[PDB]
Design a protein around this nucleic acid. Structure first.
Ligand SMILES: N[C@@H](Cc1ccccc1)C(=O)O
Ligand SMILES: [Mg+2]
Ligand SMILES: [Mg+2]
Ligand SMILES: [Mg+2]
Ligand SMILES: [Mg+2]
Ligand SMILES: [Mg+2]
Ligand SMILES: [Mg+2]
Ligand SMILES: [Mg+2]
Ligand SMILES: [Mg+2]
Ligand SMILES: [Mg+2]
Ligand SMILES: [Mg+2]
Ligand SMILES: [Mg+2]
Ligand SMILES: [Mg+2]
Lengths: 243, 835, 334, 49
RNA sequence: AGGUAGCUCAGUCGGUAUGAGCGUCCGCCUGAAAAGCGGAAGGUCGGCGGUUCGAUCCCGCCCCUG
C-alpha cells in the first residue's frame, strides 16, 4: 500500500546545479563570493572596462532602473562581483559567485530574461592562461564526467584581455558527442586590476562565466526553458528532494 | 544586427590572392580558420545550386495579356543560337531585350524544384524567368532578376554568370575589431593566419593618387565636433542613364546591399572593400560654403526619407547656407541627395567621433552601415585613398571626368601621423601570459603581420600599432594578437594550487539547510520573478503609505504593466501557486529563498567615479549606500490538501497552523528560538496571523491569507503563507551540553481554566516558570470549551514529566512542583485549577 | 575532488531520517547475550555466523553484530525504561559478516611493498563489513496535541522509512510480502531495487517482542546500503500546459491481490495519457462480497499537445480497466 | 498553539562534529579516505612499524 | 471583424439579458467515488465618457486578439 502521508518536495534543479558547482570549487580550496542583483553602473560596466557611449555597452540587453539619470540597473552578469571581491579581500583571490542575472530577452524555449550565472575569479602572482585552462577542465570534468574536454577560442569581453569562449565536449550528449558553447573567459584586464588598486605588473588573473540554465538545458536535454522558470511542481519533483 | 559582416568568398580570395597567387581553401577549412583567430561565423551560405538547362536569355517581345486582374504578360526569350522559347510570367520589372535567367524544362532549382512544361493561362509555359530569391542568390522575390546590360550573351550557363559556385559568409565581428568590417580587414586577417604576403587594397601601390591642385569646395569646421578628417572630391558630368556592371552589383547584393544609381553603388562598394563609409552628394544642389557644427537647442532637420527629427546640442551635422545637409555619420538629407536628375557629384570621406555618432544614432533610433562602422572607429589614414578609389570607380562606370581638385581637413593641427602612441612590452610577455614557450621571434613576427612596426632594444619591444588598430593600447592588447594567431589550442592545461580555503560561510550553509528542510517537508522551490504583478498591492488592499508600496521601478520592462520590482516574495509565489492550480495541481506547497528590493530615501544614483585608480573608502560607501536595501527573504505558500488522501484516510486540508509549522521548520534549520504573537498585517487574515519574533526582533509573519485578498486575487480558498527576513534572523553557533538524568521520571497532568483569549503559550510559560528545574517536559494535549467550563473560558490540559538529577523523584516531590506551577499560572494568567 | 557519491549519500540519508523524526544512535558492535535465541532464529540462519572477540569487556557479549537491529533495540529499551516511550531511532554503520574465506594471514614482510596478491589476500581474509542503515520505532509516531490524540506506530511507518531512504538514494524501490524473523510474518516486506533484495521492514514479531521485553507494536527496518546501487540521473520532465481530465475508477479484486499490482496493471493499460494515479480507498463489506476488496484510484489524464476530451480520457480509462482485468482479474465496481 | 505534528529528530552530535571536520579539510583540497573496523594485524600494527 | 455568467460560445439593432455547453453547488445513484441523469445558483453585455427621462444596442477615445 502507499505509505507517504507527507509527500516529498524538491529544491529547484537550478539551485541543485549551483550547489554541485559550488561544492566542486570549494573542494579545490576556492570560496563563494556574493553581490546584489540591483547593481550600480559603476560596478556592472565602468569598473569592468566597458566603454561609454559605445555599442559594446549601449547594445547590451540591460534593464535600466528609474529615474533616467540613476545609473542603477539589474545586473546583466555576475561579473560585478569581480569588482566587489577585489575591493573587499586581500590578495590572492580564488572565488566563484553564483546568482541571478537579467537581460531583456523574451522568455522562450531557449531564452529567459532571468537566469543564473556562475562567475569565477582568480588573482595571484604568476597566473597564466594555462591555469585558466586547468580550472575549466576540472570544472568540466566535475559537471560532465571524466570524458569531458574544453575548447577555447578567441573572443572579446571588455574586462578580459585576452578574451575567449569556452566550448565543452562530453560523452552521451545530444546528437552524440560534439562541441557545445559553454561560457566566456579570459585573463583579467589590467584596467580592471587598476580600478581596484592592484598592480598589474605584480598580479595577473583569469575569470570565467557560464549560465546555469543553458548548462542544464544541453546537459539534461530540457527542450523548453520555460519549464525551468515557471514553477510547475511537475518539473521539479522528478529531480528529488535535494537533501 | 549592428555587428554583422556579409561578403562573398570570391571577393575575399581575390583580395588575398593578389599577395599570394593561387590561394584557395575549402569553405569548411576557412570557417575553422576564422573561428581559430576569433571571428564568429554565424552562417555559411553556398549559392545555388542549379542543374540542367539554366541559362541566361534575352526577352524578344512582351505581348501583354489583358483581361486579368494582375498584369500577366507572355514573353519570348532567346536562349542563344536564336532558338526562341515561350515563357509566361507575372513580373513587370523588365522590358524587351533585358537580360534574364530562365529555367527550361528539365532544370532543377533550389531546392527540390524541377521545372516542367505546364500549360497556364492562354499560352504555353515551358519554362520560367527566375528571381534572385528563386535562385538562392538574393533576398528579393518581388521582381524578376534582370542582369545589367552586357552581363553575358544569351546561351551562357547561368551557374557561371551568377557565380553559383560561390559561398557567402555571414560573420559577427566583435566590437573591438571594427577594422574587420570590410574586405580589407578580413583579407588582412587571413594573410596573418596562413602566413601570406598581403597587398593592402587601400594602398597607393595599386593606382597613383589623383592630383590635388586646389580646394574642391569652401569648408569650415568647428573643432569641438570631434571630426578627425574630412575630404571632398567632385566628379563632373556623369551619365544618369548608365548603371553599374554585373560584378559590382553581384558583390553588392551578396553583401546585403541593394543597388540603386551608380553614384551610390560605388560609395557602398568602396565602403565594403576598404571599410571607410562613403557618401555621395549632388554638387548642383549644394549652395554656398559647407560647415560642420553642433545643432541649436531645437533646430529640426529632415532626412532623405523626409522625416524631420528634433536635434540635440550634442549632435554633429553638416549644414550650408541654405539648410542642413546631413547628420554627421548617421544619414544624409534630401537636399544634396543624388538622383537620376543629378549629373555632378561631390563625394565626401569623413571620420566622425565614434562616441558622438553612437549617442546620436541611438537617440534618433536609426542605425546604418555607416554608423555601425563609425561607432567602431574608421581608419582615418585611408580617407583620400578611398576617395580617389571612389572617384575613379565612379567615372569609369558613369563616364565622367575626375576633377583634379581636392579638399582635405586634418584638424586644427595638420595631423600627419595617424598611429596610436607606441607601446613598450617585454619580449617574453606573451610567453608568460600564455604559459607557452613560443619559438624565438614569434612575437615580433606576429605583431608585424597585424601592421605594427616593432623595434628591438634588449628584452623590450617598442610596438607602434597601425592606424586601423586603435584597440592596441597596452601590452595586454598586443598579447592577445600573438596568442590568437598562434592558436589558443597550444596552451597547456595545468591546475593551479589554490591556498587552503575556508569553505562556506555560516549564511551560505544556513541557506542550504533551510532548503533541505522545507523540501523534505513537502515544499517545492520556485525561482521567484522580481517583477511584481500589476496592481498586486491594490488587490491586497494595502494602505497608501504601506512600506511595501515603495518599489524600485524599471524603465524598460518586458511587460509594460509590470515595471515595479518586488519588495516581498509572496506575489511571485502566489503567481506560481495560481499557475499550478490552473493546471490541475491543486494541492501545492511552494517556497522561495531570494532577495527583495526595498529602496529608501537614501536610494539614489551615483555619478561616474574615475576608474584609473581604486575608489576611495567613502566612494565605496557611497555606492553601497545608494543602492536599495536587498535583504534575503524566505517565503512559502500552501493551498489545498496539506496531507493527501490515501488508504489511511481523507487527508487533511491546509490550515494556518501549517504556516506556523513552516516558521518552526525554518527556525529549527536556523538553530534559533522563535515566538509567535497575534498580529494584524495584510494580506493575512487578522484573526489567523502571527508575527514572528526572535528575541524582541520581528522577523516576519505567517498564517492564513485574508478571505477578501483571496477572492480579489483568484486564489484558492484557505491559502496560507509565511514570509521571513533571513537577514533579521541572527546567526547562532551553540555548543549544547544537555543534562541527561538516568533516574526515573514522574508523570502528572494538570488541567487549567483560563479566559478564552489567553494564549496557550503564555499559560505554558507560567507553568514552566513555577515548576522549577524538576520539570523536564511540558506538552499541551487538550483545549476544551463547553458548558462544563463556562462562557468565555477554555480549559487547557498539559502533560508534565518531572525528573530529578540525582535521585528517584517521589510523588510528593513532584506534586509540590506541580502545585508551584499551578500557583505561577494563577498569578500570571489567572489560571484556575479545573474542578 | 571532494566527497564521493557514497559519502554524500550517507549524509543525505542522515538528514532525511533526522528531519522525519528519527534520532541517530551510535550502535555497539557487541551483540546482546542470546539475542538470536530471543528472536527464535533457526540454527542455520546466516546471522548466527558471527565473528567473536577473545577478550570482551562483558564475558557474555563476545559476538560482533551481523545486524544493526539488536543495538538499536537495546537503545530503544533504554529510552523506554527512562520514561521516553515515543521513540524513533536510526543508525548508519557497518556490520561484520564472516564467511568460510574469513581466516588469518601470517606476517607479510614490511621491508617492501606487499604484492598485489598479498593485498588481495589480506582483503579477502577479513569478514565482510558492508554498510547498513536501520531504524526502529515504538509508541506514538505522531504525538498528541490540540490537533488530536496522535497516531500510534504502524508497520506502514517502517515502509515509509524505506521510501525515505530510497528517495535519499535516488532509487526506485518495490516492497514484496515476505516471512523473515524477527518480523511479523503478516506485516513484513522485503525491499527490492530492481530484482536485488536490499533489506526488510515492517512490524516485529509479537513473540519476539514479548521475549525481548520490547514495546508492543515495535517496528523496524534494515537495509544493506552497499546493495543499493548508486544513481546519477539527469531528468528531463515532460511538462504539458494543457488541461487535465480527472476520473476515478473503482476495481474489485481478491483480498490478497496487492494494491501495487492492481495499480501497475492500470498504469500499463492507460498509456502515456495517464499523468498521475493514486489509491484513496480500500473497501471490504457485504456490498463487495466475501474474500474480495474494492480499490478506488484517482486518475489524472493529460495530453502533451492538446486539450484532452472526456471521450479520449474514457478510452484510456477503459483500456486501463481491460489491463487490470487481464493481469489481476479486476472487475469494474457496479 | 503547538503546531509540530512531526517532531524533529537529530543526527548524532559526534557525526555532526565529524561532518564539520570533514568539510574543513575538503575546503582545503583534501579528500576523505575509508577503512574497515575489523582490521588485520598487518595494517593495524606491523605495517605501521 | 469581434469582446456577452468563473471559462468556452449564440442572441438582443433605445425602455423586463432570449439563452445554451462546461464548471460550481445541490438532491437521485454509491459504504464512499467517477460517470451518468435531475435541478439550482450564476450575467454595471471591454474601460472611459458623452447623447437621452432611460444605453449591452447609437456617437468619441482607448485597452484587448487574428
Ligand atoms: N560576464 C560574461 C562572461 C564572462 C565572465 C568572465 C570573463 C569573461 C566572460 C557574460 O555574462 O556573458
Ligand atoms: Mg541597451
Ligand atoms: Mg558567441
Ligand atoms: Mg584585444
Ligand atoms: Mg503519577
Ligand atoms: Mg501514578
Ligand atoms: Mg471528468
Ligand atoms: Mg467532470
Ligand atoms: Mg442575428
Ligand atoms: Mg441560460
Ligand atoms: Mg437557465
Ligand atoms: Mg444547487
Ligand atoms: Mg457574479
Amino acid at each position: 500500500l502507499p505509505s507517504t502521508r507527507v509527500p516529498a518536495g524538491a529544491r529547484h534543479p537550478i539551485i541543485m546545479l549551483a550547489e554541485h558547482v559550488a561544492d566542486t570549487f570549494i573542494a579545490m580550496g576556492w570560496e563563494l563570493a556574493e553581490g546584489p542583483e540591483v547593481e550600480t553602473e559603476q560596478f556592472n560596466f565602468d569598473a569592468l572596462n566597458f566603454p561609454a557611449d559605445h555599442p559594446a555597452r549601449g547594445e547590451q540587453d540591460t534593464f535600466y532602473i528609474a529615474p533616467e539619470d540613476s545609473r542603477q540597473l539589474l545586473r546583466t552578469h555576475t561579473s560585478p562581483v569581480q569588482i566587489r571581491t577585489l575591493l573587499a579581500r586581500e590578495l590572492p583571490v580564488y572565488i566563484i559567485s553564483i546568482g541571478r542575472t537579467f537581460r531583456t530577452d523574451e522568455l522562450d524555449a531557449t531564452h529567459t530574461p532571468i537566469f543564473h550565472q556562475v562567475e569565477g575569479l582568480a588573482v595571484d602572482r604568476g597566473l597564466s592562461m594555462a591555469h585558466l585552462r586547468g580550472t575549466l577542465d576540472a570544472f568540466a570534468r566535475a559537471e560532465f564526467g571524466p570524458s569531458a574536454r574544453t575548447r577555447i577560442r578567441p573572443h572579446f569581453f571588455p574586462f578580459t584581455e585576452p578574451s575567449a569562449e569556452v566550448d565543452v565536449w562530453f560523452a552521451n550528449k545530444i546528437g552524440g558527442a560534439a562541441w557545445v558553447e559553454w561560457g566566456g573567459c579570459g585573463m583579467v584586464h589590467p584596467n580592471v586590476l587598476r580600478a581596484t588598486g592592484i598592480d598589474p605588473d605584480l598580479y595577473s588573473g583569469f575569470a570565467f562565466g557560464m549560465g546555469l540554465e543553458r548548462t542544464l538545458q544541453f546537459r539534461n536535454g530540457i527542450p523548453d526553458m520555460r519549464d525551468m522558470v515557471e514553477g510547475d511542481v511537475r518539473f521539479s519533483l522528478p529531480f528529488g528532494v535535494g537533501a | 544586427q549592428s555587428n554583422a559582416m556579409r561578403l562573398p568568398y570570391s571577393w575575399l580570395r581575390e583580395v588575398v590572392a593578389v599577395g599570394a597567387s593561387g590561394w584557395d581553401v575549402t569553405p569548411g577549412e576557412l570557417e575553422q580558420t576564422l573561428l581559430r583567430i576569433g571571428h564568429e561565423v554565424e552562417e555559411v551560405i553556398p549559392l545555388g545550386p542549379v542543374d540542367g538547362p539554366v541559362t541566361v536569355g534575352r526577352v524578344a517581345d512582351i505581348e501583354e495579356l489583358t483581361g486579368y486582374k494582375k498584369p500577366i504578360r507572355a514573353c519570348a526569350v532567346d536562349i542563344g543560337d536564336r532558338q526562341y522559347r515561350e515563357i509566361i510570367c507575372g513580373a513587370t520589372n523588365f522590358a524587351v531585350g533585358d537580360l534574364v535567367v530562365v529555367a527550361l524544362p528539365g532544370a532543377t532549382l533550389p531546392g527540390g524544384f524541377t521545372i516542367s512544361a505546364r500549360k497556364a493561362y492562354g499560352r504555353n509555359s515551358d519554362g520560367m524567368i527566375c528571381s534572385a530569391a528563386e535562385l538562392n542568390l538574393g533576398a528579393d522575390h518581388s521582381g524578376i532578376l534582370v542582369l545589367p546590360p552586357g552581363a553575358a550573351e544569351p546561351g551562357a550557363d547561368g551557374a557561371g554568370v551568377l557565380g553559383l559556385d560561390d559561398v557567402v559568409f555571414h560573420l559577427a565581428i566583435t566590437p573591438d575589431r571594427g577594422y574587420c568590417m570590410s574586405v580589407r580587414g578580413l583579407a588582412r586577417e587571413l594573410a596573418c593566419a596562413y602566413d601570406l604576403d598581403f597587398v593592402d587594397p587601400a594602398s597607393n601601390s595599386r593606382v597613383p593618387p589623383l592630383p590635388i591642385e586646389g580646394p574642391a569646395w569652401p569648408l569650415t569646421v568647428q573643432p569641438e565636433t570631434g571630426v578627425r578628417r574630412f575630404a571632398l572630391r567632385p566628379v563632373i558630368g556623369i551619365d544618369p542613364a548608365a548603371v553599374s556592371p554585373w560584378w559590382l552589383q553581384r558583390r553588392l547584393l551578396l553583401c546585403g546591399i541593394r543597388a540603386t544609381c551608380p553614384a551610390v553603388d560605388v560609395t557602398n562598394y568602396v565602403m565594403l572593400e576598404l571599410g571607410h563609409p562613403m557618401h555621395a552628394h549632388d554638387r548642383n544642389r549644394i549652395s554656398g560654403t559647407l560647415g560642420v557644427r553642433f545643432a541649436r537647442s531645437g533646430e529640426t532637420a529632415v532626412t532623405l526619407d523626409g522625416i524631420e527629427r528634433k536635434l540635440d546640442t550634442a549632435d554633429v551635422l553638416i549644414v550650408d547656407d541654405a539648410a542642413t545637409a546631413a547628420i554627421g555619420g548617421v544619414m544624409g538629407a534630401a537636399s544634396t541627395e543624388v538622383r537620376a536628375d543629378s549629373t555632378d557629384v561631390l563625394l565626401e570621406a569623413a571620420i566622425w567621433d565614434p562616441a558622438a555618432v553612437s549617442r546620436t544614432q541611438r537617440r534618433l533610433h536609426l542605425p546604418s552601415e555607416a554608423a555601425r562602422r563609425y561607432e567602431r572607429t574608421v581608419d582615418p589614414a585611408i580617407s583620400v585613398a578611398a576617395l580617389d578609389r571612389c572617384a575613379r570607380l565612379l567615372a569609369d562606370i558613369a563616364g565622367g571626368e575626375v576633377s583634379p581638385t581636392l579638399t582635405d581637413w586634418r584638424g586644427d593641427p595638420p595631423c600627419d601621423d595617424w598611429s596610436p602612441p607606441p607601446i613598450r612590452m617585454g619580449v617574453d610577455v606573451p610567453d608568460r601570459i600564455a604559459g607557452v614557450a613560443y619559438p624565438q621571434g614569434t612575437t615580433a613576427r606576429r605583431l608585424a603581420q597585424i601592421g605594427a612596426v616593432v623595434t628591438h632594444d634588449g628584452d623590450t619591444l617598442t610596438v607602434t600599432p597601425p592606424s586601423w588598430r586603435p584597440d592596441l593600447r597596452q601590452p595586454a592588447d598586443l598579447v592577445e594578437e600573438v596568442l590568437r594567431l598562434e592558436g589558443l589550442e597550444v596552451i597547456p592545461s595545468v591546475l593551479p594550487p589554490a591556498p587552503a580555503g575556508r569553505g562556506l560561510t555560516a549564511g551560505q550553509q544556513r541557506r542550504r539547510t533551510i532548503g533541505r528542510s522545507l523540501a523534505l517537508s513537502g515544499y517545492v522551490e520556485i525561482l521567484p520573478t522580481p517583477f511584481l504583478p500589476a496592481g498586486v498591492f491594490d488587490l491586497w488592499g494595502l494602505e497608501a503609505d504601506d512600506s511595501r508600496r515603495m518599489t524600485t521601478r524599471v524603465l524598460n520592462p518586458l511587460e509594460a504593466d509590470r515595471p515595479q520590482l518586488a519588495t516581498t516574495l509572496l506575489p511571485a509565489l502566489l503567481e506560481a501557486l495560481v499557475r499550478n492550480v490552473s493546471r490541475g495541481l491543486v494541492d501545492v506547497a511552494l517556497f522561495a529563498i531570494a532577495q527583495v528590493v526595498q529602496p529608501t530615501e537614501q536610494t539614489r544614483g551615483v555619478g561616474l567615479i574615475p576608474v584609473d585608480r581604486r575608489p576611495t573608502d567613502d566612494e565605496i560607501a557611497m555606492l553601497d549606500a545608494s543602492l536599495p536595501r536587498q535583504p534575503q527573504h524566505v517565503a512559502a505558500v500552501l493551498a489545498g490538501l496539506r496531507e493527501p488522501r490515501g488508504p489511511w484516510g481523507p487527508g487533511r486540508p491546509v490550515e494556518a497552523a501549517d504556516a506556523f509549522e513552516a516558521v518552526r521548520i525554518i527556525a529549527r534549520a536556523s538553530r534559533v528560538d522563535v515566538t509567535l504573537r497575534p498580529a494584524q498585517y495584510l494580506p493575512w487574515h487578522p484573526g489567523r496571523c502571527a508575527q514572528v519574533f526572535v528575541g524582541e526582533s520581528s522577523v516576519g509573519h505567517a498564517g492564513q491569507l485574508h478571505p477578501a485578498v483571496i477572492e480579489r486575487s483568484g486564489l484558492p480558498k484557505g491559502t496560507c503563507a509565511v514570509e521571513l527576513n533571513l537577514d533579521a534572523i541572527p546567526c547562532s553557533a551553540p555548543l549544547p551540553a544537555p543534562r541527561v538524568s538516568p533516574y526515573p521520571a514522574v508523570f502528572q497532568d494538570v488541567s487549567l481554566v483560563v479566559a478564552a483569549d489567553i494564549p496557550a503559550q503564555a499559560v505554558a510559560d507560567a507553568v514552566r516558570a513555577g515548576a522549577g528545574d524538576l520539570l523536564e517536559d511540558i506538552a499541551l494535549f487538550d483545549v476544551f470549551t463547553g458548558p462544563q467550563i463556562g462562557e468565555h473560558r477554555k480549559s487547557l490540559t498539559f502533560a508534565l514529566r518531572f525528573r530529578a538529577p540525582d535521585r528517584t523523584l517521589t510523588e510528593d516531590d513532584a506534586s509540590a512542583a506541580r502545585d508551584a506551577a499551578v500557583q505561577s499560572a494563577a498569578e500570571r494568567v489567572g489560571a484556575v485549577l479545573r474542578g
